[PDB]
Amino acid sequence: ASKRALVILAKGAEEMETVIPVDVMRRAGIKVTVAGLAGKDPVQCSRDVVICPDASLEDAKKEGPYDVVVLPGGNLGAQNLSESAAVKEILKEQENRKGLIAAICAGPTALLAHEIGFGSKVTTHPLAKDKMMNGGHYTYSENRVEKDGLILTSRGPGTSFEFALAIVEALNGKEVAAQVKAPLVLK
C-alpha cells in the first residue's frame, strides 16, 4: 500500500521548499496531498509563485492519517503555520501516533510554536536558529538534514532535495530513495 504525505501550504511558504518535496515524493510513489492552510484557493508563495493546492487543510485533515506531515519553510509561511490551531492539532496527533514530521528552513519553528518533539536534535535555516532555540527545548545541529527518530529537519532551499530524499528513505526505504535520486542529476 502506498504511503501518504500531507504537505501544509500557507501564504508565504517558500515555493522551492514546497515543490521539491512534493515532486520528489510523487516520484517515490507516495500519495501527496498539497493542502491549503487558508482554504481551497491558490496560495501566493514567498517569491510570488502561485500554487493551487489539491484540497483545503480543513478537508485534507479528514482523510488522515498520513505517514508524514511536511512543513515547508519561508519566514511568513512558517509564521502562518505557527499561528494555526489546525496545524497544532495535526502535529500533536501525528506525534501521538508516532508518525513522521518533516520540516525545512523556517518550518521547524512551527514545531517550537506547537511544542512538538522537545528534546530532539534539529536543524533550521541559519537565520531561524535563534527563534528555534528560544528556551533551549531542542539541541541544534548544523547537518544539512537532521533526523532524530520521527522528527526530520533540514536547512534551506539548497537542502530541499536531500530533505525530500530523506523523507523517501524513511517511508519507502534506501533502495527506492536511490532509484528516485539517480534521474535527478544531483551532484
**Which residues are annotated as catalytic?**
105, 125
- By C-beta, is 50 or 178 nearer to a copy of itself? 50
Closest approach of Zn ion to the CB of residue 12, in Å: 10
Nearer to Cl ion, 104 or 170 (CB): 104
User: Strand 121-122 and strand 100-104: pairing?
Assistant: unpaired
Subset of 65-94 contacting Cl ion (CB under 5 A): 74-75
**21 touches Cl ion by CB under 5 A:** no
Measured distance CA(10)–CA(79) in Å, rounded: 9
Q: Which of 1, 48, 96, 98 binds a copy of itself (CB under 8 A)?
A: 48
Buried b / exposed e over 44-69, threshold 16 CB at 10 Å, is: ebbeeeebebbbbbeebbeebebbbb
Task: Annotate each residue in 148-167 with x if it binds a copy of itself (CB under 8 A) or - if it does not, as one string.
Answer: -------xxxxx-x------
Distance from C-alpha of 110 to C-alpha of 132, rounded to nearest angstrom: 9
Considering the complex, state which of residue 46 and residue 94 has its C-beta at the smaller distance from Cl ion: 46
Among 6, 8, 16, 70, binds a copy of itself (CB under 8 A): 16
3-state DSSP assignment of residue 81: helix
Strands 68-71 and 121-122, bridge-based pairing: unpaired
Nearer to a copy of itself, 25 or 111 (CB): 25
* Residue 107 DSSP label: T
Length reported for the chain: 187
Count of residues of this chain found to bind a copy of itself when the rule CB under 8 A is applied: 33
Q: Which residues bind Zn ion (CB under 5 A)?
A: 14, 73, 105
Sorted by sequence, the CB contacts under 8 Å of residue 10 that are 6+ apart come out as 37, 38, 43, 74, 76, 77, 78, 80, 81, 84
Residues in touch with a copy of itself (CB under 8 A): 14-16, 19-20, 22-23, 26-27, 34, 42, 46-52, 125-127, 144, 155-159, 161, 183-187
